[PDB]
Design a protein around this ligand. Sequence first.
Ligand SMILES: COc1ccccc1/C=C/C(=O)c1ccc(O)cc1O
Ligand code: NA
Ligand code: NA
Length: 133
Amino acid sequence: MHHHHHHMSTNPPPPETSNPNKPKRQTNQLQYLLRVVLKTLWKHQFAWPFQQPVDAVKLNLPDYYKIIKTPMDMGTIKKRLENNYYWNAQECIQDFNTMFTNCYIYNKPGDDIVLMAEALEKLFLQKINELPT
Ligand SMILES: COc1ccccc1/C=C/C(=O)c1ccc(O)cc1O
Ligand code: NA
Ligand code: NA
C-alpha cells in the first residue's frame, strides 16, 4: 500500500506568454499599458502577490486551482506585453480583470489579499481611465 503518499500537490503550467500563431499588434494603447499602467502597478507596495502565477504549493493552497480555472497574474501580463502577445488593449485589460476577479472569487471581503487587490484595482482603473488615441 502506497497510501497515495506520492500524489503531491503541484501547480498547473503557467498561462502562455507567446503564441506565434496568435495575431498580434503594437498599438499605442498596448505600449502605454506596459510602460505606464503595468509598470506603476508593479512598483506598488501591494503588487507582490500578483507579480507571478499563484504558487499554490508554496502558499499551501491546494484548493486554489480547484476553484480558479482561469489563472492570471501581472508577471504573465508583463511577459505578454513584452512579447507583443496582444492584438489590442482590451485583451490585456481582460487579463487584469481576470486577475482581480480570481482574487475576489478565491478569497473573502476583508482578507488582507483582497484589500491588496482592491487597492491595485483602484489604481488600475485610475490609470486606464484615459489611454492614448
Ligand atoms: C492567501 O494568500 C495571501 C494572503 C496574504 C498575503 C498574500 C497572499 C498571497 C501570496 C501569493 O499569492 C504569492 C506570493 C508569492 C509568490 O511567490 C507566489 C504567490 O502566489
Ligand atoms: Na470569494
Ligand atoms: Na491613463
